[PDB]
Amino acid sequence: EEETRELQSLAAAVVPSAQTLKITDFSFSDFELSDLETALCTIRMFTDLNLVQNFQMKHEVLCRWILSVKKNYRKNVAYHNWRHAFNTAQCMFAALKAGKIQNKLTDLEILALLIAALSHDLDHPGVSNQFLINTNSELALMYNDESVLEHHHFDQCLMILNSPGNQILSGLSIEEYKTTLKIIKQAILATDLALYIKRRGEFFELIRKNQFNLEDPHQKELFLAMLMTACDLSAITKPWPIQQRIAELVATEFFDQGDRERKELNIEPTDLMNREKKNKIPSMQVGFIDAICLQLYEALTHVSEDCFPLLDGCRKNRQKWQALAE
Numbered sequence: 001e002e003e004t005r006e007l008q009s010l011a012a013a014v015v016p017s018a019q020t021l022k023i024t025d026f027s028f029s030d031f032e033l034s035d036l037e038t039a040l041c042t043i044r045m046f047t048d049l050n051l052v053q054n055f056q057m058k059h060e061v062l063c064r065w066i067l068s069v070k071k072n073y074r075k076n077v078a079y080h081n082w083r084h085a086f087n088t089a090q091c092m093f094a095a096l097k098a099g100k101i102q103n104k105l106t107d108l109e110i111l112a113l114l115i116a117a118l119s120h121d122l123d124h125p126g127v128s129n130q131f132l133i134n135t136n137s138e139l140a141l142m143y144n145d146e147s148v149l150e151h152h153h154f155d156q157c158l159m160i161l162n163s164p165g166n167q168i169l170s171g172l173s174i175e176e177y178k179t180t181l182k183i184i185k186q187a188i189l190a191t192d193l194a195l196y197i198k199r200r201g202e203f204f205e206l207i208r209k210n211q212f213n214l215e216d217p218h219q220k221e222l223f224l225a226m227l228m229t230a231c232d233l234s235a236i237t238k239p240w241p242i243q244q245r246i247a248e249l250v251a252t253e254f255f256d257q258g259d260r261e262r263k264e265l266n267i268e269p270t271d272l273m274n275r276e277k278k279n280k281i282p283s284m285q286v287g288f289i290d291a292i293c294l295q296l297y298e299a300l301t302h303v304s305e306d307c308f309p310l311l312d313g314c315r316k317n318r319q320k321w322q323a324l325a326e
């Protein structure tokens with residue numbers, strides 16, 4: 001069995017230090033790492049956040065769970081694949097450690113965030129929520145057109161967590177388990193950009209007015225959602241060579257959806273899904289940064305100044321894209 005071999009290889013390998021793996025760096029790149037190495041990085045993230053120790057995770061179970069998560073991403077989807085999920089978790093790790101966000105959260109919240117980050121795009125088909133609704137996909141029918149992809153991702157997450165030999169939450173009490181699942185679901189649903197756009201104004205206003213208070217349960221939940229989005233979109237903050245590469249992957253996925261819309265819906269795709277409008281990418285990236293990204297990274301820096309590198313990188317990438325749009 002090809003999978004039992006993968007499991008043994010992973011379980012027997014040494015876990016290099018966080019320093020060696022560079023996973024505390026906001027500028028981290030997975031490009032030169034093998035699949036096995038990304039799995040080892042993932043073990044190191046769980047380990048250095050004290051999750052293995054505090055929740056008594058069995059090494060073998062953690063290894064299998066990480067392998068189940070990775071295998072449940074589609075290798076044929078250009079951007080929303082295991083590497084995106086892995087990078088999102090890495091950004092979460094960096095924000096918690098280098099950005100000092102770990103001191104503001106509970107162990108259960110950190111556990112949920114890391115699991116959620118790794119699991120948030122599980123089995124992503126490479127098409128948008130609106131595409132799924134307009135084509136009457138089984139997913140859209142299943143979830144009544146509401147955060148379709150995100151409900152699917154959480155259901156896939158739960159399926160992995162409840163499957164034999166992958167139960168990494170077996171060391172939690174029942175009350176802890178129920179709490180953790182509730183947070184994971186909210187954290188995964190938060191990655192629906194429509195929900196981010198809907199909820200972020202409250203967060204930005206609380207920050208502007210110096211009223212942000214993490215002891216208020218609603219504000220804590222709001223913050224966790226915002227942090228999920230910050231990590232989900234973090235490729236936009238990477239050094240230029242990395243961001244330019246990831247942007248090509250994002251455009252590939254979009255153009256592939258546009259091809260599907262041409263054949264299956266017999267429509268002309270919008271500019272962002274139109275491969276013929278490839279020349280417009282730079283201005284669309286500037287638009288994405290201005291409307292979606294910049295305000296979030298600005299707000300996060302007010303929460304913790306040590307998260308500044310995310311804002312800095314985002315600003316630098318805006319300058320490079322704007323230069324290419326003239």
Ligand SMILES: CCCc1nc(C)c2c(=O)nc(-c3cc(S(=O)(=O)N4CCN(CC)CC4)ccc3OCC)[nH]n12
Pocket residue numbers: 128193232233234235236246247248250251272281284285287288289291292
């Ligand atoms: C859903 C992809 C979110 C995302 N992550 C990253 C790193 C990127 C990136 O670099 N660039 C794009 C990105 C975002 C927009 S957008 O802001 O206008 N917008 C279009 C519709 N979408 C999806 C439903 C919401 C926002 C437009 C073009 C984009 O990329 C072109 C390569 N989006 N993106």
Ligand SMILES: [Mg+2]
Pocket residue numbers: 120121149191192
């Ligand atoms: Mg998603």
Ligand SMILES: [Zn+2]
Pocket residue numbers: 084088120121191232
């Ligand atoms: Zn994502």
